[PDB]
Amino acid sequence: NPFPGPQECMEMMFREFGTGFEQSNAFIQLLTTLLVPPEGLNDSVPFPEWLGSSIRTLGIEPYVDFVFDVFANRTKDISDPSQLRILRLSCLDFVMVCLVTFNEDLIVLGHESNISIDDAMAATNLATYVRLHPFSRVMEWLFNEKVITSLINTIHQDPISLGSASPDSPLVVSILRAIQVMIKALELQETYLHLVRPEVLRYQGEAGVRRKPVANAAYSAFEDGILSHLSLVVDLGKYCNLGHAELTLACLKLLEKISTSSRILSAWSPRNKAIVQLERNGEGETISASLSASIMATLDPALAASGENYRVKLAILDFLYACLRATPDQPTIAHQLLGFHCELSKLGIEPKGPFDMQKSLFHSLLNVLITLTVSEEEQGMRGYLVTLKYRVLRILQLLWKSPLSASLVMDELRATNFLFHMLLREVQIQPQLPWDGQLVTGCEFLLSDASLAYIDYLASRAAIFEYIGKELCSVSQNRIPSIKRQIFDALNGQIFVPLTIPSIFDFFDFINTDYKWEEIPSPHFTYLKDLDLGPCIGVHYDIRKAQEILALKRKEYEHSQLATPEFLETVELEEKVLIEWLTVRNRANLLLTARLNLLQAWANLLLVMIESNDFKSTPKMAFLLQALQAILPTLE
């Protein structure tokens, strides 16, 4: 009643506060600040449940509705680009503050066990939370064409502006916020369409609510509204040459999620559109060149896990892995970025191209891999180097297994002596060399993160052995002794360019039963002994399945009213021991399967070597006896 009905006065005041930019931005900031709870950034949604109960209003929805209507329609009356950028940034921040304040796991567990197991008392609380929280309205607005059009217009800008702009420029911050909102929407679209739409529809059907739809029924998902924009990927790729770590990581994650989808790649390749869009003015070439220049940039030894360069490298590697693992038979953008001529159900190399001159992304990866040393002195056997090489080897294996990109890759590898570089980069493992300053025999080893690096190193050795065996089989079937001599010399322990290297029998040091990975010390467990891991269990024992059971048991014991305060610490320490027991069992299973895979790879390599061997046997009798001596204790 601002001094005329309230439904009219409120909209009149909102429209009055919409004229201009200063007052609009100030109101948006005020609303964003008010939406923050007093405890800071989970229940008790930050607003009174009786907000607007007197008048026939939907609560706090009108505010978000007006904000979205403004951001969608009145963005053309702003001449000053700075004001428009500030308004878009404020709207994106408001949307993010509204989305981040939504419970996902809570609603999932509710819809799962509340009505099916728990009573119907708390159901009303979750219902009111889902009905009053503005997340549903934001998601509904996200399916509008105006919103995505404004977003892609804001993200589509000239490169000169971003180049001459400052890292703290509002344009970069707005683009980052928009990418984050898009990521959150792509993550929560399924949860919404599953546990919001039906409940809201049922509530609207039962009770009396007057709401105006703002979503498009045709857009069954968020990808339907964005699959019509081809310049988005081009802009995301061009924005990688700016140097901004956060923006680069966001763009890489967005491209990875896009390549991971299915409808987008079904619409693109039902000839194709992306390959021709990225080959308009040589965008792929410059993108590959920028990626190569980036991965070649060194890292900061002190800021191992904080070096933005290493983070960008890992993001690019994850993107390539996700793009190659998805739909390997049909080519993708990864093949074009590597320097291949992506043709319909066929690949090829062009003359004088970047991949022909051995200057491309794949060759850059090969170089940075062969010029990488993991053997250190101060710590020795670092972890992030191991992770990097493991990712590189996974990408190489994904490229090799694909028969569409196997022959050319093997040719390019054998034409540069990659196996020789790998062997020269090999390092022997012993129980004395610690992992990141920590010894293996220590009990904390199974609890520390060194297990991941150990599994990665085992997988790397297995992949190297498999590649060596495949190359040996190829050279044998090709009936050419020009390379067989060098292969045997490398296996004999000599190199003629003589440089010596440890033989294959030297690397047979990963089979050791002294650690007793199978045996586990079982504590007394005077209580909770009957709690098994039935619902916990692909050997993967979930911890929540036992956490809920032990919590229910503790609640029952407390309700029994028999020395509940004293014996609580016993149950607490038993749970703290059981969680580490489960983690140790999982790590032991992982180590066991890794050792099994490595042993299988080594056995296959040895079989391929023994079978395809025309060299005399009397000289190799020494190696035969050595292998027999080495396997004797293993069999025993």
């Binding site: 051995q358 170089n367 020789f420 190199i495 360019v497 440089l499």
Partner: peptide, 9 residues
Amino acid sequence: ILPMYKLSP
């Protein structure tokens, strides 16, 4: 063609 890929330590 192989400026640095050579095995010349």
